[PDB]
Amino acid sequence: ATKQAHKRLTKEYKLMVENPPPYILARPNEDNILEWHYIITGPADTPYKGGQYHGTLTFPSDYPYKPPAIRMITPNGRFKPNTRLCLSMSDYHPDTWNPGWSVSTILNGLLSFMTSDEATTGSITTSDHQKKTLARNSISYNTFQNVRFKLIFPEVVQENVETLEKRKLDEL
Ligand SMILES: [Cl-]
Ligand SMILES: [Cl-]
Ligand SMILES: [Cl-]
Ligand code: NA
Ligand code: NA
Fold first, then answer.
1. How far is the CA of 88 from the centre of ligand 3 (A)?
2. Distance CA 59, CA 82 (A)
3. Ligand nearest 95 Cα, by number?
């Protein structure tokens, strides 16, 4: 990464440790500071309640002067997986990019957009039932079918194992 980008993104992670944004866990790949991974916890008064949504922010080589590419990995019913999402703070809008936006601000914009129904490149149309099904299955998806989640968030995989144990044992 450039030295400027590396310093900036290191500080952004520190700021998130100090004041963790509601609903959002995020950190750099330990092998590439430009590639960040996040986990959004679905807010309760949405069809995403109980869901666990992993995705990435990929900062470009010219960060902080160009925006990240924003993708969601976990199937979710709102955004097509593994696809760059057209958000106000994203690489679709380099024209109105503000270098000063924090990573928390960018991620909060993703979450705020996600819980609206506004259409944009990368969004998809599903029913409420489909979103709820995907939310319910998201923890399993991340625990068993998501290679990158296991590599980046192994401590969360272990938490997930307990969560799924309790769901299975307490309901059967
Ligand atoms: Cl390029
Ligand atoms: Cl535009
Ligand atoms: Cl714009
Ligand atoms: Na590690
Ligand atoms: Na490594």
1. 7
2. 15
3. 3
**Count of domains for the chain:** 1
Closest CA to 126 of 79, 71, 70: 79
Residue 85 belongs to domain with CATH number: 3.10.110.10
Active site residue 86: yes
Return the percent helix, strand and coil in the chain, to nearest 5. 45, 15, 40
Catalytic member of 86, 97, 104, 157: 86
Task: Say how many Å lie between the CA of residue 95 and the centre of ligand 3.
Answer: 6
What resolution in angstrom units was achieved for this structure? 1.2
Place of tokens 């949504």: 53
- How far apart CA 79 and CA 127 sit, in angstroms, is 13
Q: Which residue range(s) make up the domain with 136?
A: 3-171
In which residue are the tokens 């998130």 written? Answer: 16
Distance CA 81, CA 15 (A): 28
- Could you tell me if 24 and 47 are in contact, meaning their C-beta atoms sit under 8 angstroms apart? no
Query: Cβ atoms within 10 A of the Cβ of 55, count?
Result: 23
How does DSSP assign 6-53, residue by residue?
A: HHHHHHHHHHHHHSPPTTEEEEEETTEEEEEEEEEEPPTTSTTTT-EE
Neighbours of 3 (CB within 10 A): 7
Listed residue (3, 28, 11) closest to 100, CA to CA = 11
